[PDB]
Every structure is written in structure tokens, then in C-alpha cells.
Point group: D2
Chain length 213, copies 4
């Protein structure tokens, strides 16, 4: 029969957008189309507030916006564990945690856009051993993005190439490069972002006065 | 003070998508940003069933899907008058009708994507006199689309150039080229189109068995 | 053995751009990849000056620019026959013309971007009999373009879906949406279009005062 | 009178492509449009071979390809200084080097795509003092790219927003997203990349067996 799969998306979700959500749907249809997997759940894990140089809305709000965005989803939920930790946590550790949570066990795979695959090449960003454990022990489902060539990223990285069977490249013939950075700027200018991010998220942002100049 | 404006979008809406909806929002913010207009309403007018060579879902359903898509909009409504006529009607006639309906009168403008502006150049598609009345007596608000250069379309058409003050070019720094043709194909294959078109529209399509192979 | 193929691209080429050229390369690689064909020649056929409601550069200029653009190509050539006819000609007639020449046998296929497939749906634009002859007698090689879904255009066309064996969809893994309308506007504003169209074409345009 | 400007693009150029070249043309036109500057020179500075976790073609090859790509440019040149250093150098040091040479005065500005602005946010990638020196001592000219919002990157950076007078956002009205990674993969598969990168660069690549 089919191997059960849980998809984990780690990211900022500042705020969660229709594209972040579309990523799950495209990935699920892709895995199902292979004939060997059955996606039983998706998890949105917002990053901790201590992360990066960029100023993010409080994780309390990013978790809230995801929960509200996911109310019309019957298979994707937000998990705040990662954001509730005292500090930022390398992605491989978040995978380990959720794998333990599942502990005939479904395979847990990291879901991301092709741009993340490119960041694996950034000096000192990801430890080689972590890249290895991510693709070998968990798996990667990557959704295409304009200007990125995942196939080449895989061919040019010895670690990815060696475990390419555990990397699933998905993509849809659509162009949807709405950036959350633009969303925040537009919101700051009083412009509409309706139909780019969920109606429920816009309501929360308005009610809590988020992303103001 | 500001000139009141009603935006009319004529099209197939087979089915209405998040991009069709985004078009209204981008256009409204653009007109408001000029400082001289106040958009008070938007109208989605699905095309008649006798139109074109392409097979469209019944207008009864396209009107229903738009109504449901617009339930969370406080300023855009669907108007079935055009689709209820015995036969297809040139766009200038639909504008005339809605102008009469409004009859200190707000300006009624045709809302469309830049690709429509390009179709004005198609032999025998639009009567020169209609193109003229559309831009001169009503107005055009055009939203940018990848691969189209509205500014050049305007410069190269003597009629548009002469009335360019009545043509408003809007666009947002986003890439969103999701085609309804892809939506229908995906739906026909059992794939998800969630987050590309409204949740309410997907529910109607599923409940009424639309767009099946 | 592989089937010999000649690719014919009909269009304005006002002016020819790197995108138009790229279309040939992608189509050829796709056809060779199928293992069933051997593309032996490419033909750029600029449209006549009476065509449409547009002020196009004179046909002899568009032919000359295409020729310059193709100097570094060892398999694509421009053919002025079509532009040199007294009047505009439906595309199927251009295919028939070039088919006859080939006979004086390779298969002749129309080469176009996905957007062209969408124009097949435009009321009164293409005669149904002509769409049928194109995909039934000849063939169609389509290069993808952003915002277009060729697979859906084919499936929804009662004529195209019955001839898929003669339709070849070559996907463009790169994003190359450079509009010739934009090229003309930029040129008219005195802005650079270098690296968007061939250097020799830019020079010709300058020398002859085109698009000013 | 207009302020003399020299544009410096640091990058892999593995290999140089039509997009990299287009970036210079768009930036120059944008700067001239402001009416305040006169771009007098463009400089392509390929990165050293010790840089990053990537198997890059040898620096002398990337320099040679850039030189060939630029033969038809009357204002852009490749400078191998950087690639010829014993080790990789932070970009601000390359700017200082080229600034000194200019002195042996024109303003030297870093030229990059919008994506570079986003990398400024990457933990430990760029020293804050360096980002400050780049936009405060020199200048930054950014060319738009699909999926990136430079205006937001600037507004959200406590360093960039304080130096907007020295940041110039040049918008790319065309869609030109051709990945050098894709170019390399296509080449390795024996597929054409003609019209995506200069002909002379393709020839050099073939002659020297690069990307096989
Ligand atoms: N463990 C490590 O060493 C290490 C190093 C760097 C980053 N990280 C992790 O990586 C994450 C960084 O997330 P982020 O700030 O980029 O998240 P984000 O909110 O910007 O995006 C979330 C996800 O959406 C995808 N996405 C966004 N727009 C898309 C589109 N249009 N199409 C397809 N996919 C799209 C992104 O690729 C990403 O996978 C964090 O969880 C961080 O902890 C880990
Ligand atoms: N009066 C005439 O002579 C004449 C001739 C031809 C067509 N028409 C009219 O034109 C309409 C044709 O509509 P259609 O079939 O193209 O409608 P459609 O459903 O495909 O699209 C509706 C609108 O959405 C815009 N749009 C779609 N995707 C977009 C995106 N990603 N970004 C921005 N805008 C986007 C389109 O430009 C269009 O204005 C009909 O109302 C028809 O009656 C009139
Ligand atoms: N026989 C008929 O009934 C009929 C009806 C309408 C048009 N036509 C013919 O169709 C042609 C119309 O040509 P045009 O004005 O669009 O020519 P054009 O110069 O704009 O483009 C020529 C070709 O390039 C392709 N192309 C352009 N940019 C591209 C990109 N970025 N990526 C991929 N492909 C790209 C186009 O799809 C087209 O196939 C003429 O030859 C005309 O006679 C025939
Ligand atoms: N000093 C530091 O701390 C530091 C840290 C990281 C990187 N760097 C430097 O940054 C550079 C990294 O270069 P790279 O590997 O990205 O080079 P690259 O060859 O990929 O590209 C070079 C330039 O082209 C631009 N570009 C590419 N495709 C484009 C397109 N389609 N449209 C517009 N612009 C486009 C890129 O944005 C970039 O500015 C190196 O010089 C490196 O030393 C410096």
C-alpha cells in the first residue's frame, strides 16, 4: 500500500499568504501522483521570535494568523511548539521533535520552496551534517519557484545528489511569486492585499493593528 | 472633491479566480492613489453562453460562483443582466446599459487586464467606433500582466493615444498569472485549486459537479 | 530512422528578439528529445505589410533584421516569400507554399508560442478548416509562455484534441517574457534594448532610423 | 553638472549570461534618467575560486567568458583583480580596492539584483558595518527581480532605510529570469542555451569542455 506522509513547513509566515498555503496543496497532489505516498497531515511551524535580523510580528500573532488561515483546511494545522521554545532552533531539531511526536510510522518530510534548497549553499547557514540528516532521515518536498532550478541544485550538491530519491520536486504551471515582504509593505501603506492572503488573516491584522508603518 | 467611479469587469469568469478578484482591488487602490477618484462599486458581469468558440459552464453557474466568491467583498457584486440576454452583447452595449442604470453621475469604467488592451488590435474583433466610445465616454482601467506592455499599446493606437487620459494603468509588483484554463484542467484531473480560487467557488464546483472531464 | 522536420514560424518579427530566436532552439531540442525526429531547418517568415491594424516596420526591414539576427545560426533562415506577396495570406497558405517547395520528404510543422494556441479560440480569427489542416496535414510545435496553459487549450478544442499526435508541447523552463512592444517603446525613448535582441539588429535599427 | 559613476558588479558569473549583462544596461539608463548622474564605466568582477561551497568553473575561464561577452560593449569591462587574489574577499574590500584605483572623482556604486538585498538579511552573511559602508561610503544600484520587493527590503532594514539617497532601485519592466544554474544543467545535457548567453561564450564553453 501507500507510505503515509506528514509534511512539515518551517518558515516565518509573517504573515502566512495564499502562496504558502498553495505550497501544501501542490506538494500533496505531487506525492499522491507518484502513487507511493498518502499525505495524512500538514504542519505549519512558525519560526521563533529570536530568529534572524529581520523584525517579525510576534510569534503569538503569526501562530494565530496561521490557525485562522487554516480553519478551512481539513488536513493542515499550525503547531506552535517551535515558536514556544526559549530560542531559535535549527530546522533538523524541529523535524526530530515532530518525528518523536509521531512515534509502522509515517515518514515526516520537510516542505519548502525551491529557494530554500538554494540557501543550503550559503556559507555557514546549514551544517552539512544537518543537510544530510534532513534529506536522508526525513525527506524534502520542494515546490518550484521562478528563477530557481532545483534539478541543478541537486546535481551540484554531492549530499543532495546522493540522496536525491528522498527529494521530491513538485511544481504547477502557475506563476505565483507574491512575496510576504510586499504584503507587509502594502499593508503598511493602507493598500489592499485581499485575494493574496486569506480573508481571515486580513481580519486579524486589522483587528490587532499589525504591520503598521 | 473626488469623482465617484463604478468599475465594470466583463469576462467569462469560468470560473472566477483569485486573480480576477485581485484585479478589482489593485484597480481601486490605483484610482484612489491618483487623488481624484472614489470607487464606490465594482460589478462582475459574466458573458452570455452564446459567446465564443470555447465551451463555458452555464452562465447560471458562473453567476452563482461569482456571487459566492463575492460574499466577503463589501463593494463588488455580480450582475447577471448581460448573461440573461437572449444573446452575446458587444461590451460597449453592456457599458451603456449599466450607465443607464446609474442614471452628478458617477463615471462608469471598464476594468480589464492588459491582455484585453492587446485584443483591441485583433482584426474584426472590436469595432473602432466601439473602442472609441469605450475609452472616451466611459474609461478603461487596465491591470498589468506579464508579457504585456500597455504603455506601448496605447502609444501605437491612434484612438487610445488620443484618449489616454481616460485610460488608467494599474499594476502591483506581484506575479500572479494563474489561468482559468489551468484551473479547469486541474479540476478535471482531480487536483486541488485551493488558494488559487475562493473556497466558496470550489465548494459550488464540487457540489454541482462542474468542470469534469 | 528519424523523421526530417522543418520548422516554420510565422509572425510580425517587429523586430525579431532573443525570445523569438530562443523559441526555435527549445522546439528543436524538444523534438530531438522525443527520439522520433531530426530537425533539419528553421524558417522565419515575416508577415506582409497589409496585415492587421498596426504600423509595422516595412517588411524589407523586418526581413533584413531577421537575416542579421540569424547570421550566427547554422540551421535557421528567413524566407521573405510571404512578406513579398501582394497581400496578407492566411497561415495555412504559407505552410502549403513552403510544403510545395520542399517537394520541389521532410515534415513541415508550424512553430509558435502558446499564446497562438489561445488565438485559435478567437471568434472569426482562424477558420476551423484551417486549424484542422494545420494539425492534421502539417503539425504544430508550441513553446510555453507564462500565463498560458497549452494542455488545456488542446483538451478544450474539439479540433486540437483529435490530433495530439501532431502537436508537440515544448516547455520553456526559463522565464523569457520580453515583449516586442516594449522593445519598440524603449527604442523610441532612447533606452537600451541590448542583450534583449541581437547586437546586429540594434545596429540596423539605429542605421535606418526605425522605431523613432 | 552630472556626477560621474562607475558600476561594479561582483558575482560568480558562472557563466556570465544575457541577464547579468542586461542588468548593467537597465541600471545605466535608470541612473541617467534621474538626470543627476553620468555612468562612465561598468565593471564585472568575478569571484575568487575559494569562495563558497560550489564547484565553480576556474576563475580564469569565468574572466575569459566575461571578456568575450563584453567585446561588443563600449563601456563595460571585466576586472580580474578580485579573482586573482589568493583568497576570497568580502565585497566591501573589492569596492575599496576599485575606489583607490579610481583615485590612482567618480562615485563608485555596487550593482546587483534585488535578490542580493535580501541576502543582507541572512544571519552572519554580511557584517552590519559592511552593509553600512556599502550604502554610506559608496552606493547601491539594485535591479528588480521577480519575487523580490526591494522597497520593502530597504524599509525593513534599519541600516538601508537611513541611506536611501544612495540606493537606486531600477525596475526591470521585462521578465528575464534565466538561471545560470539552469544554463549549466542544460549545457551538461547537451541542450542549447543559444540566445540566453552570448554566442562567443557558448563557443568558449564548448572549446574548453566547461560544464560537462
Ligand atoms: N537549520 C538551519 O540551519 C537553518 C538555516 C536557515 C534557515 N532555517 C529555517 O528556514 C526557515 C526560513 O523560512 P523563511 O523565512 O524563508 O520562511 P517564509 O515564511 O519566507 O516562507 C515559508 C516557506 O514558503 C515558501 N514559499 C514562499 N513563497 C513561496 C512561493 N511563492 N512559492 C513557493 N514556495 C514559497 C518558502 O520557500 C518557505 O519554504 C526557518 O524555519 C528557519 O528556521 C534553518
Ligand atoms: N465588444 C466587443 O467587440 C468584444 C470583442 C471581444 C471580446 N469582448 C468581451 O471581452 C470579454 C472577454 O473576457 P475573457 O474571456 O478574456 O474573460 P476572462 O474571464 O478570461 O478574464 C476576465 C478579466 O480578467 C482579467 N484577468 C484574467 N487573469 C488576469 C490576471 N492574472 N491578471 C490581471 N487580469 C487578469 C482579464 O484581462 C479580463 O479583463 C467578454 O466580456 C467579451 O464579451 C468584447
Ligand atoms: N491564417 C489565419 O487565419 C491567421 C489569423 C491570425 C493570425 N495569423 C498569423 O499569425 C501571425 C501573428 O504573429 P504575431 O504578430 O503574434 O508575431 P510575433 O512577432 O509577435 O511572434 C512570432 C512568434 O513568436 C512567439 N513568441 C513571441 N514572444 C515569445 C516568447 N517570449 N516566448 C515564446 N514564444 C514567443 C509568438 O507566440 C509567435 O508564435 C502572423 O503570421 C499572422 O498572419 C494567421
Ligand atoms: N562581503 C560579504 O559579506 C558577502 C557575503 C555574501 C556574498 N558576497 C558576494 O556576493 C557575490 C555573490 O554573487 P552570486 O553568486 O549571486 O553572483 P551571480 O553570478 O549569481 O550574479 C551576479 C549578479 O547578477 C544579478 N543577477 C543574476 N541574474 C539576474 C537577473 N535575472 N536579473 C537581475 N539581476 C540578476 C545578481 O543579483 C547579482 O547581483 C560574490 O561577489 C560574493 O563575494 C559578499
Amino acid at each position: 500500500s501507500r507510505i503515509p506522509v506528514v509534511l512539515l513547513a518551517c518558515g516565518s509566515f509573517n504573515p502566512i499568504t495564499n502562496m504558502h498555503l498553495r505550497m501544501f496543496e501542490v506538494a500533496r497532489d505531487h506525492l499522491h501522483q507518484t502513487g507511493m505516498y498518502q499525505v495524512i497531515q500538514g504542519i505549519i511551524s512558525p519560526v521563533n521570535d529570536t530568529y534572524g535580523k529581520k523584525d517579525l510580528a510576534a510569534s503569538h500573532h503569526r501562530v494565530a494568523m496561521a490557525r485562522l488561515a487554516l480553519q478551512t483546511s481539513d488536513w493542515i494545522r499550525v503547531d506552535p511548539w517551535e515558536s514556544e521554545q526559549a530560542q531559535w532552533m535549527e530546522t533538523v531539531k524541529v523535524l526530530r521533535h515532530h518525528h518523536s511526536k509521531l512515534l509502522a510510522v509515517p515518514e515526516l518530510k520537510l516542505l519548502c520552496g525551491a529557494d530554500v534548497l538554494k540557501t543550503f549553499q550559503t556559507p555557514n547557514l546549514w551544517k552539512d551534517a544537518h543537510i544530510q540528516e534532513i534529506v536522508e532521515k526525513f525527506g524534502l518536498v520542494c515546490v518550484g519557484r521562478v528563477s530557481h532550478d532545483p534539478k541543478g541544485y541537486i546535481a551540484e550538491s554531492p549530499i543532495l545528489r546522493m540522496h536525491q530519491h528522498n527529494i521530491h520536486l513538485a511544481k504547477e504551471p502557475v506563476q505565483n511569486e507574491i512575496s510576504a515582504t510586499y504584503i507587509r509593505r502594502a499593508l503598511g501603506q493602507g493598500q489592499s492585499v485581499k485575494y493574496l492572503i486569506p480573508d481571515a488573516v486580513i481580519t486579524y491584522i486589522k483587528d490587532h493593528g499589525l504591520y503598521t508603518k
